[model samples]
Target chain A: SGFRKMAFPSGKVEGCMVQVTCGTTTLNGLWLDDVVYCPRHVICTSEDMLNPNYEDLLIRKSNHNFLVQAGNVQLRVIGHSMQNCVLKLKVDTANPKTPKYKFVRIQPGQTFSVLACYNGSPSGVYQCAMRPNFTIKGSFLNGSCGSVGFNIDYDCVSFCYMHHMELPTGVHAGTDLEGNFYGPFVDRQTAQAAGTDTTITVNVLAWLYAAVINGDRWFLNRFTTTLNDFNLVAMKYNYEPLTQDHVDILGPLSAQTGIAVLDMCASLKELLQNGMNGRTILGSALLEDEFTPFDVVRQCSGVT
Target chain B: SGFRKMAFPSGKVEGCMVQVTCGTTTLNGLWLDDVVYCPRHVICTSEDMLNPNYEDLLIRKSNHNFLVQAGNVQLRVIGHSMQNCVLKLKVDTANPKTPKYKFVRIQPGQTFSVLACYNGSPSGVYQCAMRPNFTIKGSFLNGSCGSVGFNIDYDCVSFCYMHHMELPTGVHAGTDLEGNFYGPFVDRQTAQAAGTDTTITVNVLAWLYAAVINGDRWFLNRFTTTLNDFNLVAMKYNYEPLTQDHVDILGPLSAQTGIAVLDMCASLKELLQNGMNGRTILGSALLEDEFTPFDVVRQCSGVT
Candidate 1:
């Protein structure tokens, strides 16, 4: 018979800490090896809080690797155990320095895979990284070793130390409480030169067009006055002058002009009905000159 | 009365680029004495786009600046006024970098000033510089002059070079169809990190507490399982595990022991009214022994 004996030691062996590193960077330097226990009796006393089974109270363990499916590409990260860990994933379609895609806190020990079902061009390399610890553990580990990093194409999952979020569609939509949107494009000098030409052309077109369209002298006078008001408003608002405001100021004036245009439309309808073609005088003298705004006339007559 | 007729020649001026440097660093630069035409028309036209009134447009003949009021701030600018002219305005504030407080553009040749109404904070030093040309001239050289120099704290205004549409809040919001939101915070990393902890903690805590109170054996068993699953998910997804998630898991577990916490309200109600804790004795018995089948107790609990 084999003699069997059990011995109990009074001293405890201190567990050693492993320093996990990636290249020159270290991930986690220490982990406790103590077996944590909960007082089952105390918990069981609370009938309301007690679960039907202890196993039910325990959380399940998960796998660390992830398979991300985007478009026709498949990205798989092999070795890292994501269990109980959060990770930031980033995919760059162009410049690696600036990633265009981002995914937030993916749960630990679970594979996160996404299929591309949206639009827009996805043309760039993809990379991912675990934040906070910022570890680049490779695709897989040999036995109980550390991570083995590698570089994958746009489709393959490799070690990437970056993640990013998706961008919005517009600046206004993205603005906060402050009225500020994005920013200064070019310097002031260039803007000044370009602004000058744009403003002048707009203002001139608005002024001349309003005068011609509205045949009523009073409306035309009002148009000029309103144009000045708009100009002042523009000045105050830092808005370009001679834009929609010019057209709007002329709206009342255009009401007067509308009568002339209507008359012209009527005349033209009649002329077409009568099959008249050569140099037809379509409206009254006032209507003929005032119906079409100067801009319209210029467009039709090829007058600059 | 002193009357001065200053005749500034009207002609295109070239070689106006001036680069100012502070030792090896370039603080700012300016281009002066350029016979640039004030594109007041652009301001006028753009303003007209919003409102109609030509004569209503007020042009300050003195410095040829456009005057306009946007939101609660008054705006004005000088030099070649253009639709996309970049106007930099300096504000009297502690931190001008804060996006909430900013300045608006002024039309060419117009004086810009607005009554401060923001109650949160007092206004700070104000200044404006046209971009590209970096013309730091305001109101006919009234304020300090510098060639687009950078002031640590100053209100600045500039047109967005990118196409942007104003939103309901008077802020520009638009994207480049890449789902990218422009302005201030466009990077994916920043966006993903924003408010992430708040969301994860809220979700995890609620679920954990719920599982405990119901004596849901299956739920309790799955809670830890799910947590590990989430950890894996986070790792797989490359998301940073917010401290909140860890706190939620460990905090409740350490405090309640292995058993789930009973719902006090439900327990009291059941005990007083039905002489029962709404839990079966068989399930309760399983809690006494650590080796019992968790699933068996869960089945006998007769609770969801």
Candidate 2:
């Protein structure tokens, strides 16, 4: 998704374009076009702000009633309300003080998941929940947990963004998330795993975290309002992933993790190139240059 | 870069592709080649990893050293031991604990400049230095600053990649510091001062960050290893700013928060089609239908 080879300037630096006219002056303003040096970083954005079940993030009943987070690793609390109160997911009922999967302070019509968390069921299988209970401060208006809150189990699911991945109902959603958070990777493995892994919606959140850590708060504000939807990815590929049926029902596996047909290719290609845990993304045999033409998708005749 | 268009196998699911040849030996062999499925998440990756200033993160000479971090507005003291050393980097003579910018623990031989910071001088210049004097821990086993370390007031700069941009006797590093860690949209008024706007070295880091957050730790791992160098971007597009340079740079100035070049384009494009701040990426003035064949670099005749 880089610059589409706009201009090829001479010298060591590249990615620059030529000027057609310089001020009122003409003569083709060739030579050294305007030099706009690449900046410290760029805000990663998506064509779709955020959706799939976006209705879930909506405030339907005005005051908004239904909005629950992770109660059990079982089924996720997509969109709902316990009626009048705010929804606060609680984990470890043993002690209301600190629940691993807690979503405190989110009233029926607030926060809209400004903060989130990752939780897992006792049987395994994890999920990401919204509404943060930011330690010490307690909940939003002093409210708290499942029902309005629940309890018991798990801690954090790492800075994982499988938000768009398959749920127990078999999922599919394309899009990343907000920015200016924390724990962006300082290493690549975490990032590589981000792509090869699948169905999550991390977006450029990780990069912003890096900037934050780098003390670039001034820079972060500029991106405080960009969306990470999947509209463009769809438009580029002609809206197939969005219209496809079993994409979520499991007619094909592409839907569960919420990946588009094309992006899935890049993700896998990355895995083949860089193995995981000393092995391939497969956890075993790794793939090398057995094939080329990475950019093109051709159906060659079967060979004997 | 996406998935190679593999031939879909004639089967129950469409996402699956059959192996070169079908096998019926017993039965189970039929489940391999096209077995990849939609998962909780997928790893995102790239072919070319990292480079440039790579040595800084290196653990040179035996025992490692160096690793300053951006800990809030204040300073941080991570793990390490510099043993007997000369704590360089200047600080308030009155405030013994805090140094202007510090990179202690990392010996001159190790860590290079894995840790970092950005600073400004009263004379109107900025510098990134290492070696902070913590209140709790003593320096270099039992050492102090402004003595043996006096000479190197400016050991390192914020842009480790562009350390040569200025300094080192008669040095002229063309930029200033103290802005947040987003896109350094300085030259834009200069360049926009071309497009008349704003900046995208904001993409790669964004994409890599996306990969990192997805929990594609494996994929994130690759980005982690790849050096964060700027030479390639300089090589591919030459040196002039692309027509849409500032868009990425300022599409959300944060996009250039330190992302690499090519990626900034994707990051910017993604933002454009999606919309931002109630405004579309293309804005009220779309740049579409203006030029065709963006890939070619020819100095064609201009219209009269």
Candidate 3:
């Protein structure tokens, strides 16, 4: 049997709206006018969306990110794209005897697999990227000769959002509509020409009245936690070939605390231009060129 | 820069003769009639060839096997083969802190690399196979961002021995010749028909004197050391990802004192039919079907 998979980044990254489909569920989120659509849930009220202090309602509301404490699970990347994409997968098999903090660079259309090989109780943690872009973390346990416990953290747009996104709108599971979606256009005139009222799922009548019917073009464009502390666990396992370049950069970074801060835009651009850098996870960027109509920093950089 | 490379198992394995070329040196060996030709040296007289107690002359004479005590070096498999051959590469990084004993299966035409990453003085040992069939062991030291000390032990025949082998034979360095070589033929009549004098290099005129010139067919066919004790050194470095099955089978075997015993025929046949058997290093066989010309156990098993 195959593994039960999951995908993330169920919200916004920069200005691009993102969604993911793993196993049987799809986590998606987007902004249509003043209303906010949360992944795995319904539309949020204008009052809550406007209240910046309502982090409880907004933060936890996004199900795109994860942090699995201890157990066994398989982390993999799926979906296809005309434009190439890259993902980062890091695993810390907390076995002090043979500690290993492995980071892998995954490309779209290619299958990359990782799992822990520890006996007794589970003592490993892993992470995968999600739509909202925070990265999912987890672990794998058990001594099954068939299982390798590891996680994949990848949060970039899939081609699905561009050509095939279906959502419900209106008050309660409103009207179902379909059309070419338009992200936040710098010029309203371009958005006005490109926007399709049928693509608006939050409130069809409202968007139809404003955009298609009323000719408004301002809508579009919008944009965690927990450690069951991984440091407390001892990760161990050794059996992959690594190069000098990989160790020089990755070793220093993995030893540090918190996610290594890197400019995603630069790294993503590098990945798109020249494939994986061969040495580090900083350049494993994967996303369709057409997925986001404009530069991420220019259009999606701000939180409106 | 790339690594300083080496290949091994420079003698006969089963009924087939094997040779390897690494860096700028080629290790090769073979036998015809009563004379024995060792890899790096000229032909040996019938006197020492028949002396079993003169292991120093015979064993050390073959340059295919090695056991490096310390220091850093790169181990890789090279050369092309029409027949797929599987080579086993094992490394004991003896680092008690993060002890890693890695076993890798290498296939012909595919490059497999391994190295040690350790600070301070050198501490690691590796091995590669040579003709005459014993594995070569060595080590890698010196902490450099550009080196990983690992060895490849491959004793099986390469397609080169079948189609491109050129060895020096005779009492002195005899005349060089080329021909479509023939292995130990089951029947003398078959050997006579397929044998060519040009392919015989040891004593071209002698083999030409016997086979073509004299009509002899019973002459073909024929077939280590060490311890700069690998256990004495402490090897360490942890970065490869292994499977649960790999840990279970390989881990236990690596901990044992000697090489794991298995039927090479069964394993090699399995590798030829199927690909790599994912879990262990038992079956990564590569060899052209016509390389040996006969069943290994039936023809080459005896060290005549």
Candidate 4:
């Protein structure tokens, strides 16, 4: 056997570890990125945790080879018997580099504004140092893997009119947690220009839509209140309007996207079935205090 | 919020564990068959391994309830703040009984014939006392959940013309690891009777077909030789024959069955594309030595 590479869809990640361990003594294994080598002479046990992805692996007397490659990363292993495989991970100076990603660490109670990209992908990811305290009042621009982009008024100090998104292809359509559809977006510039015409509605819609398309379910749960604040104004006052057309576009898209989109689609479909009824309309009170359509306040009430 | 039952399709199973643990010193959690209880008044941590299925659960101040249902298992958790929830799993004598299935333990080098069912499902599971040593010359009858059946000659001593299968729905069509198709059997009785009509081919076909349908990839690797023996007889002598019709029927069926069937199907499809050439046709030498259509010799074999 030889080497192979494992891959995943854009923005999805899983942590995996491989080790050569078993019941017998003097067993050894070696890992070289997507490849591993175990000599035949050494006695080995069958139970080695090579890749947790496959179960009930039987590595006996036969020669075996495995290669796991995913996007930018690759790992391979080769051995006469899987049990005899041994790797000097720390001592092997020739080991390949670990898969790398651009990481930004924002300290708690600190504020900063920055633009960043991951591996030339505009749709980079941002995670809160403390999840509940994160907020933003800017756009996550449409950027494909080849052309990464980000534009944000990051609020590490407190909650603001929070928004976040993931855009793999600059031009794609998607829906929000509130069931509102946005897009057929051409690019970040086009979306931003359109947002100028529709108050802050188009921008936020783009953010939410892109998030759902990328299967970021946490985006909905984290920014529910901010959405509620804006949606109230859009539905009640036509300030940032939603149309039945938007809902229709997402109906078919949601079904095609599988389980991830289905939950968000189900929620949106429910909103369609149950029209906005006896409800009081309200905009972001925090935004009103800032004298702008969006909020950039410190120590805001509620969560991101 | 309340109790829910988890169910599996049939003989499938997964091992899961739950714990109410956190960052704090004094924390607690309790588990019932399908439920958990955590009270509000006490401070609790956000992270808890309730069910590994869902990720990033946001259990804040709001009262939350979770019901995890799988086949024959249900677990529910309730609390005002997920952080404050606690349970007395061991202390709470009121815990429900764990999901139960029929389990049998077989000793190494011991041989016995027995009939068993799991949760009223006839398609029961058998694990090796030692996977390599386990063997049998018997038929796993066509049994549905409503009507269970097993008729076998168990040989824990050594490998015979070892055969095994899983029959969730008795009257289902399937293909083998060798790419051969087996019928839409009316029942176990019909299948066995048909075996008499065409040697042991019909019975073995059913076994392999059912295994593929159930997504048992291991079955293919284990019983390769035994199948090779019978297949040789059928192809060369026209005893227990296979037809192109069988292959044609399973082509469409395999595609529709998703990933589980896809791998097995791919193998079968490849066999069709590349006709068996240069094969030295031969029947089971073991079966011939037994002086019967099948074998039941002790300490004689290669593998299961």
Candidate 5:
């Protein structure tokens, strides 16, 4: 009988304070007054917010300057925006442990800032989170910060602080977060019914291979080269295509031409044993130019 | 008036020793012994040494087992197979005015390790200078302490205690050291005209862009994904193709489109600029669509 499996109790913890911060300096120091908090679920409203995942955080920018008094540190929230749009502040911190806040209302020409204290913090390390409220049609703004103020077209909410920090520093881990080392597009396939053009499949294997090889080479050259010292280990193995029964005579034929195929039969003696076992070796003794017989006695004598 | 250049004197300060220590816990502690050092001028002869700029120190397997005295610490030698290697050991002292000492030597198999002692008269660190006469290929069996023996290739060398100590653990600073980011291949015409068809010249502009983009993406995914927290300022700039006219239009175009085209323009603008101003922009505009005087006014007015 199979062994019984053991059951364990669920020790899950809920309503935890999940603080996500990004910047050179500490998160509490940068966005002081405007305490940013993300909820368990976030909804995507527009194409700009499509596919919004864990990376998206609803920032609550205050209309009037809010004072953030924690220990000797004090920060004032001037205003805030989402994707360059000035977002209306909704302070719903009634439940400090699990506060649910939202930026529902937003208008044009609004500004936001954080009056951060710099008793020990460095300058230019902290600033206000303000964004333009109006969206320009057809014009795409690339390289905008993927935050409330600046919105990136692609969803980078899944990226970690290390990854985001290194992006500007030029140290990347992989191509995509989904573990798809290959880039976005793969191949194009077209199909049609009868009386129509033949189906065609455009294979991008070559291009993918080129991209992977080139990308990997570039990565290795950029990071691994500067390292003080390192070592690499590689392994090799042999593989056979078919079973022994299907290739009984192939080995003897190859052996006759000085190219020995040693599978189960490693030597002439083994070949004879195989013959005794009803497995016949290929070739005949009569045809010297074409076929050759297994000279077990002579081969064995030579070895001794 | 031109800015003045400053120069500093290079003097030799004797009796200073640099120490490199591994992490705590004996199992995790890195041990080094019988180190090798090389000056800057010496050429490395190993085929595995792809980048010839940095010095190399080879350590045999036996060298990993050793004890560091009171002043000494463990160090590990790392790098690809190469000709010459240099290890810069760190010095541990209370006063900064003490004279510094740098060691240079060539040893086989033995890694570098230092001892720390506090009972000395001056209460300072000291290292033993043991020189063994052996060819490059000969293995340095029987390490300082009882250690195993192993064969070593010419591509491998001895270790330096100083250089071996700084091996990054969980995180590492990824950057190019050799400054040779791209190239080794030249165009067919250039190679043939120069009587060297085998040579290849590579353009570093594209490579730099790919590195920054790919590297930043990798870092963000691996480290942090907070859009506001992600640092993009570290991205390398490609200014090879930027012309005076292109430079003038950057601010205005950014203001209008809200997109950063500095890199794209700087990479390809020179090919079109070719000693002319305003021509490249005009040509680009023509290629996209016919830009009338009204179009210019509309674009410029939007920026203001």
Candidate 6:
């Protein structure tokens, strides 16, 4: 017969702790603490907070970690864990110095980023991890353990633009509340080399294209004036702009993707029957913005 | 040049809160201690969370998200709708330092993980942010700073074991623990030298085929590992690594190809924004009512 903790009885039972602490104590399965308040009681009570064995609440007995290697700057670490976890980071650098190592641990709900656990100013190969051998292999924490990885060249430029690209991306990320005082003021420098034809019009087109690519981000009007900007972009290249009245007629498009969903059933019928009586002329591009053009028009003058 | 607060005399606003939170006292736009003023503003209904940034009830305006590129780890952030947003993250490294990142906020409900916001310690380029600009732009909410992000070799090494993927999908759209993971993983690496096949097995032909194309999901049985792991890799080369109780049946051509589902907001979303049945999978038509239940959360009134 195996008994883990002692039971209680006989007037004064045995145990340990303070304020309802079911201490790391054992009293013939009878008492849980040595310090008992009002020692004698018919009905002993404890703070509900101490009612559950803390460890029993540990379901996430694994750690999730990552090694930060952004360039020249400093290397950092971000660790997360649900139960007991320790990250053993390794150093694999270029400069031949018998590599050294470092480590990090996370407590349940204690997840955050820290300066990486590395030897020296982290300019080498670094590896970190949680104990790989265990039962129930946890959260899998993600598709299981991966292998040694590689590093690419560092350039914040491409990323500046990539940030605007909402794609099913690839490696390249970082965030600073004040990164490049408007990646624009800086990106503006990379613009087709000044002697290159550039203008509010061209840049707007670029930002417009960016919006379409990034999930109908509506970047076209995102930070533009409340006048709902684009109507004028159409006014450019010798074309009439769209009136809100016309848009009200076209109605909604696919909120996501921004691709115009077909309203062929009723809306299309009305467009044909009603025709373009009071409608104003617009540029071919402006019309394309709301609908996919089928090699048709150049201007609103009768679908070109 | 402006401010507000007050309650009662109107049914439009349900309770009291403050901007300059002028209590229910009296004054001509000038109140102290016991204060009040003829409110000049409109009812900032909780709906304010939805309105005036109304028709611009622009769901989340846009996804200002970023991935945490850490070694052997996956870090992801999902910007929420206005209240200390919590970013779901995950990482696993064999090191120590309880790695961390100083945080960046997502206006509505943005909260979670410290390795996110409290700087210092081990690493580098610790920056990721939330842009605050536009009419809906009041708080560009700066207050952030953090460390580096790393990328390691894409070894089919241990993952030679992690091949049976499915959980990672439960991609919640985006979990108790949703986080930073770059799918399309175990991909080509940017070797420090730019040309190095730093991995196990010469990129199995099919897995290679996978990166070139895909379903909304590039369902590549990517990561696989453990000694039990290689057994399958071997099965790929020499059949029967898996003991499927043969109906006295032999191996099939299906084992090695590792086919997958393709998805992205673009292609697959088209399948969904429109139903799924007429859609195709593995070059076959799907049954009606197949992929449904597009999740939608009805508007809530308060912090409920």
Name the best candidate (by lDDT).
4
After superposition, the stretches of candidate 5 with alpha carbons farther than 4 Å from their true spots are: A1-304, B1-84, B93-304
- Segments in model 1 whose C-alpha atoms lie over 4 Å from true places: A1-304, B1-88, B91-222, B225-229, B235-304
The alpha-carbon deviation from the true structure for residue B239 of candidate 6, after best TM-score superposition, in angstroms, is 69
The digit string of per-residue lDDT tens for model 1 on A186-259 reads 10112211111112223223323433432212222212234455455445433344445435533543464453
What part of the reference interface contacts, as a 0 to 1 fraction, does candidate 5 reproduce? 0.01
Candidate 6 residue lDDT tens string, A1-304: 0000000010011000111111221111010111111111001123322233333432222222222221222222222221111112221222221112122221111111111111111111111111111001011011011111111111110111001001122111111111211111121112221121112222122223322432233112212232234434334433233344433333332232343323221222232234323331111111112111110111111110
Candidates in order, TM-scores: namely 0.15, 0.17, 0.17, 0.17, 0.16, 0.16
Cα lDDT for residue A92, candidate 2: 23
Score candidate 4 by TM-score against the native.
0.17
Native interface contact recovery, all models: 0.00, 0.00, 0.00, 0.00, 0.01, 0.00
Over the stretch A210-237, how does candidate 4's per-residue lDDT look in tens digits?
3343333332321123334435545643
The residue-by-residue lDDT of candidate 3 on A1-304, one tens digit each, is 0001111111111121223232232323221222112221112232432332333433443223312112233222221111111111122322122222232332211211212112211111111111111111111111211112122222222222211111111100111111112232111111122222211111111111122111222221121111121111101111112223322333222233222212222222233335432221101111221111111111111111
Kindly list the per-residue Cα lDDT of model 4 for residues B1-304, writing each as its tens digit. Answer: 0000101111111111222322231211223333332222122232332222111334333222232222234333343222212222232222443334222333212222211222221211221111112222222331211111111222111111112223332112212111122332221222222222222333233323433433333323211233344356456533344344433433443344432223333333333334323221011101111111111111111011
Q: Taking the tens digit of each residue's C-alpha lDDT, what string does model 1 give over B1-304? A: 0000110110001011122221122111122222121112222333353543323443332222323222234323343222222222221222212222222232211111110011111111112212111111111111111211111111222211111223222122222212123333221111121122111222233333333433433323322323344444445433333343344434444355444223322222232234322232212211111111211122122111
What C-alpha RMSD separates each model from the true structure?
34.4, 29.8, 28.1, 32.9, 32.7, 29.8
Q: Kindly list the per-residue Cα lDDT of model 6 for residues B67-118, writing each as its tens digit.
A: 2222223322233222111121222222232222121213211111111111
Candidate 2 residues lying further than 4 Å off, grouped into runs, are: A1-92, A95-113, A117-304, B1-80, B83-199, B202-304
Docking class of 6: incorrect
Off by over 4 Å in 4: A1-283, A286-304, B1-37, B40-85, B90-304
Per-residue lDDT value at A132 in model 2: 17
